[PDB]
Each structure stands twice: as C-alpha cells, then as structure tokens.
Amino acid sequence: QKIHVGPGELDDYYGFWSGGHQGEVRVLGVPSMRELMRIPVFNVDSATGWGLTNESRHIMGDSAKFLNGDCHAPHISMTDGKYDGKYLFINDKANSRVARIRLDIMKCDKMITVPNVQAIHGLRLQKVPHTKYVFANAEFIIPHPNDGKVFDLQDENSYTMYNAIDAETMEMAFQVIVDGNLDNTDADYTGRFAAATCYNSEKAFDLGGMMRNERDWVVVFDIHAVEAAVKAGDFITLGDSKTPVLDGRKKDGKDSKFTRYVPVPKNPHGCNTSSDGKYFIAAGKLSPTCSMIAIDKLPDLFAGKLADPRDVIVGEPELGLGPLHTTFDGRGNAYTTLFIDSQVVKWNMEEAVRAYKGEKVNYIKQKLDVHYQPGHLHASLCETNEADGKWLVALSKFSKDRFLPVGPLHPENDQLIDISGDEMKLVHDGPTFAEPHDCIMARRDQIKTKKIWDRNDPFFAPTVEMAKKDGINLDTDNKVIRDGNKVRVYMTSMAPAFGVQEFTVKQGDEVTVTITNIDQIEDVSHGFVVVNHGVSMEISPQQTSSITFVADKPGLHWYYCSWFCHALHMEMVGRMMVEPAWSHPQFE
Amino acid sequence: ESKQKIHVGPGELDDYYGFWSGGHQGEVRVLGVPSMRELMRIPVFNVDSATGWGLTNESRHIMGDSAKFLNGDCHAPHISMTDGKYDGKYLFINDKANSRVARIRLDIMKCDKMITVPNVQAIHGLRLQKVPHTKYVFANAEFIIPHPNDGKVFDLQDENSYTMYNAIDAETMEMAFQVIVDGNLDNTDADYTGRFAAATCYNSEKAFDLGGMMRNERDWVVVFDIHAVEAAVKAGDFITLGDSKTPVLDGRKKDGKDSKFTRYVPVPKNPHGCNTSSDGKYFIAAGKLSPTCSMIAIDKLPDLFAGKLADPRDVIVGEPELGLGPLHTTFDGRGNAYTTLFIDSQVVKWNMEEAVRAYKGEKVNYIKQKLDVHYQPGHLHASLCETNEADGKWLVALSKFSKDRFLPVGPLHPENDQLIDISGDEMKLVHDGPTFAEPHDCIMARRDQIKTKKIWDRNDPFFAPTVEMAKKDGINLDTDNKVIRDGNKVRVYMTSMAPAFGVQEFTVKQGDEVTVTITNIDQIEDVSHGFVVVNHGVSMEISPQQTSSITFVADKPGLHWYYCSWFCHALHMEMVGRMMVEPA
Numbered sequence A: 001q002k003i004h005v006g007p008g009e010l011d012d013y014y015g016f017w018s019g020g021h022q023g024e025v026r027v028l029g030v031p032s033m034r035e036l037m038r039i040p041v042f043n044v045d046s047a048t049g050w051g052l053t054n055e056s057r058h059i060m061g062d063s064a065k066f067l068n069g070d071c072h073a074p075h076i077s078m079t080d081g082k083y084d085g086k087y088l089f090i091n092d093k094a095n096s097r098v099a100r101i102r103l104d105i106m107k108c109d110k111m112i113t114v115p116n117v118q119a120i121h122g123l124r125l126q127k128v129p130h131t132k133y134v135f136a137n138a139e140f141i142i143p144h145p146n147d148g149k150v151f152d153l154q155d156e157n158s159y160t161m162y163n164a165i166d167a168e169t170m171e172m173a174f175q176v177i178v179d180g181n182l183d184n185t186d187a188d189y190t191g192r193f194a195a196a197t198c199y200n201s202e203k204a205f206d207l208g209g210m211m212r213n214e215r216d217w218v219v220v221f222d223i224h225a226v227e228a229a230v231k232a233g234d235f236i237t238l239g240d241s242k243t244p245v246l247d248g249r250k251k252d253g254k255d256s257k258f259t260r261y262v263p264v265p266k267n268p269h270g271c272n273t274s275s276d277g278k279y280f281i282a283a284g285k286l287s288p289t290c291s292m293i294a295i296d297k298l299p300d301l302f303a304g305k306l307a308d309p310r311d312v313i314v315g316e317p318e319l320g321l322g323p324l325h326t327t328f329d330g331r332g333n334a335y336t337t338l339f340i341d342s343q344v345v346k347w348n349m350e351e352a353v354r355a356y357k358g359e360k361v362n363y364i365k366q367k368l369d370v371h372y373q374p375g376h377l378h379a380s381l382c383e384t385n386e387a388d389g390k391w392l393v394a395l396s397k398f399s400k401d402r403f404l405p406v407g408p409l410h411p412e413n414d415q416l417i418d419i420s421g422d423e424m425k426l427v428h429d430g431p432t433f434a435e436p437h438d439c440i441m442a443r444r445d446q447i448k449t450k451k452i453w454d455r456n457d458p459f460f461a462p463t464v465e466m467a468k469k470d471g472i473n474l475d476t477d478n479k480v481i482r483d484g485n486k487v488r489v490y491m492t493s494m495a496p497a498f499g500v501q502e503f504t505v506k507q508g509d510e511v512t513v514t515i516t517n518i519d520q521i522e523d524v525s526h527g528f529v530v531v532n533h534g535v536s537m538e539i540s541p542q543q544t545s546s547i548t549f550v551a552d553k554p555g556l557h558w559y560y561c562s563w564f565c566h567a568l569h570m571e572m573v574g575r576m577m578v579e580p581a582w583s584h585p586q587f588e
Numbered sequence B: 001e002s003k004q005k006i007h008v009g010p011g012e013l014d015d016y017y018g019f020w021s022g023g024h025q026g027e028v029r030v031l032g033v034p035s036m037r038e039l040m041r042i043p044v045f046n047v048d049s050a051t052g053w054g055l056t057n058e059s060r061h062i063m064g065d066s067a068k069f070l071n072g073d074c075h076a077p078h079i080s081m082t083d084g085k086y087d088g089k090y091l092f093i094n095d096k097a098n099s100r101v102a103r104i105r106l107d108i109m110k111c112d113k114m115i116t117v118p119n120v121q122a123i124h125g126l127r128l129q130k131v132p133h134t135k136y137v138f139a140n141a142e143f144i145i146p147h148p149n150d151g152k153v154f155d156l157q158d159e160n161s162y163t164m165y166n167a168i169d170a171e172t173m174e175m176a177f178q179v180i181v182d183g184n185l186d187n188t189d190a191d192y193t194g195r196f197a198a199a200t201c202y203n204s205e206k207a208f209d210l211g212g213m214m215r216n217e218r219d220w221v222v223v224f225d226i227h228a229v230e231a232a233v234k235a236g237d238f239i240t241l242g243d244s245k246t247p248v249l250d251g252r253k254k255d256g257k258d259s260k261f262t263r264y265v266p267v268p269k270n271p272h273g274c275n276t277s278s279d280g281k282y283f284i285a286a287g288k289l290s291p292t293c294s295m296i297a298i299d300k301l302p303d304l305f306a307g308k309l310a311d312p313r314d315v316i317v318g319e320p321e322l323g324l325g326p327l328h329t330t331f332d333g334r335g336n337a338y339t340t341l342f343i344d345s346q347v348v349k350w351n352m353e354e355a356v357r358a359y360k361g362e363k364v365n366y367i368k369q370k371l372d373v374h375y376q377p378g379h380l381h382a383s384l385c386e387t388n389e390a391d392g393k394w395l396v397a398l399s400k401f402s403k404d405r406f407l408p409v410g411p412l413h414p415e416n417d418q419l420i421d422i423s424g425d426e427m428k429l430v431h432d433g434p435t436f437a438e439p440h441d442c443i444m445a446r447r448d449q450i451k452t453k454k455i456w457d458r459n460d461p462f463f464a465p466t467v468e469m470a471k472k473d474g475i476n477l478d479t480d481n482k483v484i485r486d487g488n489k490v491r492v493y494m495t496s497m498a499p500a501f502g503v504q505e506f507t508v509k510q511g512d513e514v515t516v517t518i519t520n521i522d523q524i525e526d527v528s529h530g531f532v533v534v535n536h537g538v539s540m541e542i543s544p545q546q547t548s549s550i551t552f553v554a555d556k557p558g559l560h561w562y563y564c565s566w567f568c569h570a571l572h573m574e575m576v577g578r579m580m581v582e583p584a
C-alpha cells in the first residue's frame, strides 16, 4: 500500500481532523498526513477574518463574543449508510455548540448553541435513511432552571439531556432528559435507535463518587418513540426555548417509552456502531473490557420481551487495560485503543460473541504498541457500510521522545497504521497541535469542492441584501455610501487593484468595507488589512466579504491586500483618510 | 551527488528545527526538517483557544494595549546570533497588520515580549544584527505617513511625510533608534561586523498608486552606517516624535547632500530581497521588475561613507542576469547563491564570484542550474544561510500558487513550501509541503542549536507579574488553595495535580469579576492541564510548574462547570469543578 506521496502525486483520502482545544477543523491528505487547509469554526482566524467579518459573526450569532472552542468529534453526513460528502459536523464542549461545515466551500456555514445544557461533548450523525438528525451529548448535570436558587445535582430537576439537531435547518429538533450523564454516542443503521455511554450514573461531582458504581450504562434511545411523542404534543419546554423536551428518565424503576438503560462497566467511554450494523460497542475504560450490545435485540428489549437489560449484551471481551474507543475494518474485526497498556488491540467480533457464550476461543488477533496512551482511533470509512479496512489512525496523548523537544508543551502523536493485511503495521507518526482527539477519513471521490464561489451563495446573502438596500450592484460598483456616522464602502477587487483606493471619513465613523472579488480565475485570493485597526479578512474569487470597524484615529491609515495575488501584489494598497474630530461637530 | 535521506520514520527524529512564519494567521510554527511535520504552534499575534494566549493575564500583559487586536500578519522569522552563528536564545518576527515586533524565547517556545513600533505603519521586513551579537533588531516600516499624523495633512509628498528604519534593542525589547529615509522600505539585512545594515526601497517615487510606484528606472538599496547613528545618539544629536522618547535621526538626502547616516545606492527596479551572503562579502538585492540581482561589495562601504568614491554605483560589483522576477536570495556556504524567479517560477543557482568577474567583462557562465518550482516562488531559505556556518544541505522555496500539487480544498489554496536537496552539485526537489495562510519565509536551525526546557522554572519572568499579585494576597502559589474576596473581585488560587483541581468548587455573586490562578505542581514532563469555564469563553493551558491565570465576569447565575481540557491522566475526564454563582 502506497505510504508516501511524492512531489506531484496526490493523496488518496481526505482526512478531517478535529482542532481539539484550538477550535478549528483541519483538512489533511491521507496517507501523507500533510495539512491541506484549516477551516475556522470556534477560533478567531486572523488570516481569513473568521470571527471578525460580518458574515462569520452572523453565523456565530451571539456566541461570536467567544474566542475559544474545544472540539472532539468531526463526522460527515450520510445517505443510506454511506458518506454523501455534503456536510461535516463538529462539537464545542467549551461553549456548548454544534457547528456545520459545508464541504463544497470548506467553510462553517451554520452554528447553534444548544439551549438549556452545558458542554456538548460526543456527537454523531444518523446513518439511515440519511443524516436527518445530528445527535449530541451534553456532558454535565445542571439545575433546571439554573437560576442560582438550587445547585444540588441530586435534586429532582437537576439533569443533562440528549440533543437532536435538524441537520439541514440546524435548529433544535428535540431533547431527551436522561439519568446519569452522557459521554460518547452512535446510531444504528435503521434510524430507529441511538445509544450513548454514561460515566456518571452516580450524579456525583467528586472523583470518588463518579467511580463508585460497578456498572454505569449505555442508554438506548427509541427515536421513533420520541418522534411520535413530539407529533402528539406530549412534551414540555424549558425556559424560553421552544425545543420539545421529552423525559427519558426512569421513574421508580419503570422505564420511559423513549429510553432503556443497559448496565455496562465501568465509567465507559467510546460508543461505536460496527459497520455491519450488528452492535453498539461500548469501551469499558475502568473495566478492561468492551461491551457489545446486539442492535437486533433492541426491539425485543423495548417491547418487554426481555427480563434483564443485560440480555441485549452478547459479548464482553476482556481486551486490556484502559479500553477507550473502537473502530472497524469491515472484515469482521474490531480495533480498540488501550490507554494504559498503550496499544491498539485487534479482535474478531463474532469470535468474542462466541466466547461470551462459554466457547473457549481466542478472539484477540494482535496487539500493536503505540506511542503513547491512545485515546480514539479511526479506520477509513468505519462509520459507513463501505468500511474498506485500509488505513487506521490512532491518536495518542503523550508523544514523549517520538519527536524533537519543543518546550514544556507536547504534540499529540497521530499514528497512521496499515490494516489492509492481517498484521497491523505502524507507518507514520503525525504530530498535531492542541489534541485533535479524533478524525474522519473519506475517499478522494467522496468530496467535491468548488474553486469559484456562486454569487447567490447563502454564506453572504445577508450582505447582498444590505447592498441592495443601498442600491448597490456588488459585481460592478465602487461607491462610498454615507449614512450619518456610518460609512459603507463597496468595492470590487481585481488583482492587483482595489476598486476603491482611497476614501475619507470623520473620526468616530463606523466603517463597513464590503469587497467583492471579481477575478474569475481559480486561486486568486485577495486580502484586506487596515493597518493598526485590528482589521483583516480574505476574499476568494467571486466571493463578497465585509468587515466593520470604528475609525477612531485621525489621519491617514493605509490598507493593503494581504494575500499574494499577482506579481504586483506588494502595490495593491489604498488609503483611509480620517478627518479629526475637532474639525466636525462634537458630541458626548 | 545530492542524495540525503528525506524519510523520518517512526521512532526516528528530525535533524533540524524549522521555524515557520504563520503568515496572515499570525502565529509561529515549529517544524521538524526534513520530515516537514509541524511539531508545535507558538501563538504570537493570534488569539489561541488552546493555550489561552490572548485570554490569559500573562499573555495580555505581554501584548500590552495591542491585546485588543485579534490579528497579525507575519513574514520574517529570524533567530538571534552571537559572532555570526545562531545562539538559540530568541526568535523575532514582524506584524505587518498592527505594526509590531514580537520576541519568542526558544527555551520555552513562547512569545515573551512584544512592542508596537511608534510613529510608523506596517512592520514588514525584519532582520537581526549578526556581529558581535544580535544587539539590535532592524525593522522596516513600509508605508509613508504624515508626521504628525493628526489629520491636518494627508499629502504623502509633504516634507513631513516619510517612513523610518527601526532599531529595537533585542534584549530589552525597547526602541533603540529610528532613521528617517527617503522613499520606502521593503527588506533589510545586516553585515558581519555590526557597522552596516541595508534595505531595499521600492517606492523611491513616494507615490500611492501602482503606476507611480513603478515610475523610476531605479530605486535603491539604502545603506546605514549604524556606528554613525549610535555616535549621534550618544552625543544627544537627535529629535523625538510625538509622545515617543525614541531617538530619531534624519537619514534623508537634503538638497542632494547625504546624511552622515545613510547612502542611497541605485538598484533596479522596485527591488525586493536584500540578502547578506554567508561570507560577509555582499548585500544582494533581488531585482524584481529587473531580471537581475545587484551585488553591493560590503568592503567598499567604508570608502563610500568616507567620500572616497566618485559615485554610489561604485559599490556595485555584480549585476547578474538571472531570469524573470527575481525576488529573494539564499546561500549554500560553498560560494553559490540561490534566487527565486517569481515569473519564470524557478530557483536559479549561481556562483557569486563568477558573476563579479562577469560584471567586469569576462566571458564566464555564472548560472549553474535552474530548478522548476510550483508555482510562483516568493522567498527561499537554505540551512544556516544567515550565519557564517551556512551548511549547504537543505533549501526551502516558498511558492504562492500551489495549483494542482495537492488535493483541492475549496476556494482557498495552501502555500507550497518545497524542500530541495542542495547538498550536491544539482538541486533535487524532494518534498511538497502545504502550508496555511502563506508563511512566506522560514528559518532552519540544527537540532543541537536549540535547547528547550521540559519543566518551567518557578522564577520564570513569563509569569513573574502573577507571582507578584500572589504575594500581595499572601499566597504561596506552590501550595495554596484559597479564595480571596475583595469587593466584587474574587481571586481563586489553586494548585493542580493530575487528575484533580486543587479547588474543586467556589461560590461567587452574580457580576463578580473572577480571576482564576492555577499552578501546575506535577513534576513529570508533558503532564499539561487545562482550565475551561463552560459557556464563559474562558480557556487556558498550564504546563508542569507553570502558573497561569485568567479573568472573566460571572454574569450568569446558577451552577457553571469548569473542566480540565488537556488529557492529563486516565481519569482526565473526571477532572472537573463547579462555580456556583448567587443571583443578584
């Protein structure tokens, strides 16, 4: 299997890395593991102006005031159990958000703050018949309402919720109150069932309390029952949110119609659907096991045909110390990270099932040492029925001496492994920044991108509407619109020249600069920086971008194109003239 | 023969550090060479969610008032030198967008000082004094502005409209002096004695439009007599501008008479790169609109400033014709120069002494090879090229239009930073490295030239101001877990030790201004902790033996979780605490 990509050769797969604590999404080529692009999401990006421009701040909404995010889990939208290449979704644990990235323009186009919860951690997409819903876990138990009258996690109104977001509209679809808490989650291959692990069935806040119970559980959701209750109006709402809320808790030992609790040891973490649709596999973390939940026994479970929720467990292989995450090669093998043993263990799911029934069989096929302390891992196409068993990435937290020292902070070691054969083969150590934690791979032919924007693209439609109110045709006009203490500069740009090369304002004016890049050739990006005003953005071909700032400094202030666009780029500049406040009417 | 190994396999280590400019994204990046893998990101002018640079009190203190900016625009990373060799102490880099120079300490790989250059706009080129050591950082301000810039005068042709050459004291990171020049400044370099520096000018016309800037057949390389400048400062013969105490010297021509501080050497045309050869013989200016480089003999500059030469052009000793669009030059230490040809889209290898002899009229071919690169190269960098130890092993050419060299990724494209083996007679392209936001230029150092710390010193100046605040509250940071109440201000101090915060709950009043100071008292390498307050925009990292702090207001009543962001321990997921906010 081709391991190295030489000059002029192209990678075979796209890789989509979580930006971890840094808050972006990163696009890699696989197997070279080179970073092809960064997609700003929850971070503020100086280069493209994401978080500064009006288009990006509009998408982020009120949360545009936050400069941070914390990502764990990127996933790609699916139709009939295969990637369709339309959207990537990712979480923000720091400020409780879900973001959607449009894979044709490789930009975040929608973002939502999940109401009435704290810390969006695990995130996973419905597989069948398509990604109708984004499932997202809120990790932490909070009071409802959280008005500062009650702080007790044990109070009857303290809880966290499982969240369903409508993938196309990016509005809340529903929420399900659960017992315990939520960690990771996955979905079946029918659309009926989803499942999530829980490490805090104790509803404790201290380390000892969260580890008391021998077993926590994975909670299973009957999505069809949830929908039928919504359509029937059998739900409540919390605070000012209109989101339908359904109660998935047990009440005095009696289950709700929406959930079932399958006991699993112990503080389990990963929750992974095998690519043949057979199992929800939970990683036991503090228990040296995984637990295999038979998805085809779920209907019986929810219909009372089983006495014990443990009856849906058909395997619980002992694997090693600190199992965290599981992936699949599509050949009947699972691969599980062992955080303490610092290994990836390859095991056969059907053989593990037969061992659970008493049959003495050795389901463990190989243990590969990794470097060191692996968290999550990802096999190519593992989340689809097309899992091709070619590549595996294990994302290890302590890289130690695997890379040159770079001071007190260390990179994550994202290790590429060849699994095309019977023997796992470590081939590349990929160091990464701010603990990406997890990633997703897609074949080259599963991703179709645009090189030139469409002029009607929703990403900047609000700006077109604004321009229209000013009587502006963005494809041609170079005009300075004045409106009291607001100035709205509209210009085209075509390398190497800004369409407006100087304009004059009063000190204190609120200036919006809107630039439409009318170059028609691929890869002619322009930039726009106002010196010493903290203003910076990128404009790609046929895109419109805008940014607003206050001209609070009298005098002449240069602006320049930051992105090399032409042999005469260094000369693509302009001048803002700011008339001193003492030469104009003075206010207080 | 050029035949170095390019593969760094699992378990093997890179041979060089590479320090990449973060370009328009504003950070510094540390790569391993020859793998070309990014080992670390060092936040500088960007706001970093992961470590809290731009949010923490220690980082905002370093940034000063400019902490209000969330952007930077970087081009020119350079490493401090002693006796013309890298000494591993500091990395310096420019911010063109908000007119700054930042210093990075290479032992901790963090920005530790930052300065806004007074009375200028757009710090672009930057370069370090080489000998006897990096006393000064030299920084170009690119754009001509009025003085004062108070909005009475906007005419760039006015007698008080000009830009300035900036010298920053490298060790104190305070301004040392500024030199007013004619025209504008592009790139700059320094000699191997400490007496001379030089910079290219493209806007000798002092025009604001594209046509007017390309008006003159020749611009120039302005040469600076730094000894003369220092002598005038020492004698008090200078002025100051506005509210800056920086000594300002007038380096402009006056009615055709030269300053004592400058000489203007005519060079074609809108020249860009300005590169000192590793043998110390030449300032080499890249011709850009002229298909040439011009070679200024550093040995002739003393006679030039002494008035012993009949024409400023006499210090020009070579002007090789190389190709279309020469922008930048580097050196292998074997006598060759390597120059980017933006238009021809090549790296041309040429022999400097043979060019000098050609300029005198000898029939000799100084061009050795042209290597196609992909595509439109800007700057280039050979290993140790800025030192008298230039080792002629690796060359990076940083090309702007990657076209079809990588998988498509939407309307934006990566820069193509191509690794080239120059160890033998023939340049060999060996690796295409895609990079984000046009790093533009980079600098390499041998592994043994960089020595980093794995554990912070408790006395480190980086968080000394926080140690001081802690003193005023009576806090021993190594041990204490205490909540100090002071009006509507709450100062939480805690140790942390994987997997537990030293303070796991505290209660405040809605509207309080909360400062959380965390001291990581783990003593094992690479056990970093994080601290994130959910839904409050608060995030930071704390490495072993570091103290880090962050301030935010508790504007939301109720229970609000905080958690450790960096995987520190098998029980990392359970390392959490609770902030309880009592309603007003």
Ligand code: CUA
Binding pocket: A495, A496, A497, A525, A526, A527, A561, A562, A563, A564, A565, A566, A569, A570, A572
């Ligand atoms: Cu337009 Cu550079």
Ligand code: CUA
Binding pocket: B498, B499, B500, B528, B529, B530, B564, B565, B566, B567, B568, B569, B572, B573, B575
């Ligand atoms: Cu401490 Cu994660």
Ligand SMILES: [Ca+2]
Binding pocket: A199, A200, A201, A202, A209, A210, A211, A212, A213, A215, A216, A266, A267
């Ligand atoms: Ca538990």
Ligand SMILES: [Ca+2]
Binding pocket: B202, B203, B204, B205, B213, B214, B215, B216, B218, B219, B269, B270
């Ligand atoms: Ca010129």
Ligand SMILES: [Cl-]
Binding pocket: A184, A185, A269, A270, A271, A272, A325
């Ligand atoms: Cl998972």
Ligand SMILES: [Cl-]
Binding pocket: B187, B188, B272, B273, B274, B275, B328
């Ligand atoms: Cl240069």
Ligand code: NA
Binding pocket: A059, A061, A110, A111, A112, A170
């Ligand atoms: Na939204």
Ligand code: NA
Binding pocket: B062, B064, B113, B114, B115, B116, B173
């Ligand atoms: Na400073």
